[PDB]
Amino acid sequence: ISRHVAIPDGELEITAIRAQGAGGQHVNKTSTAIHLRFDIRASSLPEYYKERLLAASHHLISSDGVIVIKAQEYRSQELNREAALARLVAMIKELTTEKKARRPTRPTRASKERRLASKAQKSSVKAMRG
């Protein structure tokens, strides 16, 4: 019902390095406007939903579950900062989706036409000794 964004201030490690690709001398030098976060598995906010992120095979997440997302879209670092915070809630909150199994099924009116069908063959099979 009630749900509110948490994003533990400080619990999420944030690093900053230079970008890739082409783009003059502003992308190889002071291009440290690019991010690369670190969300260890030791964080554990929900605790039990947490173990489902770890055993969950996926990219942008190592074997130890450090969760590393390298943001590279624009020059502004505050843009990739929010662009990353969005890719986390897009990865994290996309795996929270605990789809319902809710099974199985069962015949409702099979016996209402099948059983009457056989009962109609059970009466025809009387051809034998008089």
Binding site: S111, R114, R115, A117, S118
Partner: protein, 123 residues
């Protein structure tokens, strides 16, 4: 017909398919026996059949039938298997020998007790 055709190509003996490919000329076989579940029979009948999936000694995963009320198998317990189809659940063609290593006899079978492997109550 027409003998010359016959001397070139003789009368073909129909190589019949053996109904139970557990192991040819083999009366019984044992298995690890896993997967105990229940599925529905076909159009004529209407019930819930207790079946099992056995890993054979020669390595053949086949499904068998536990004939009787007595359920004495859970994901393990090695049992004995004999041939016999039940024809209602398509896919199964073997009977679990009731009175095996870990499969005991069914209770209150005071008539026809050789089958279901129950010994005689002296009283």
């Amino acid at each position: 017909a027409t003998v010359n055709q016959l001397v070139r190509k003789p009368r073909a003996r129909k190589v019949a398919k053996s109904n139970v490919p557990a192991l040819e000329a083999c009366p019984q076989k044992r298995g690890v026996c896993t997967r105990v579940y229940t599925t529905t029979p076909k159009k004529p009948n209407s019930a819930l059949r207790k079946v099992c999936r056995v890993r054979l000694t020669n390595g053949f995963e086949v499904t068998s039938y536990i004939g009787g009320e007595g359920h004495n198998l859970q994901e393990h317990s090695v049992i004995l298997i004999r041939g016999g189809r039940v024809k209602d659940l398509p896919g199964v063609r073997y009977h679990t020998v009731r009175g095996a290593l870990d499969c005991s006899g069914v209770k209150d079978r005071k008539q026809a007790r050789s089958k279901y492997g129950v010994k005689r109550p002296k009283a």
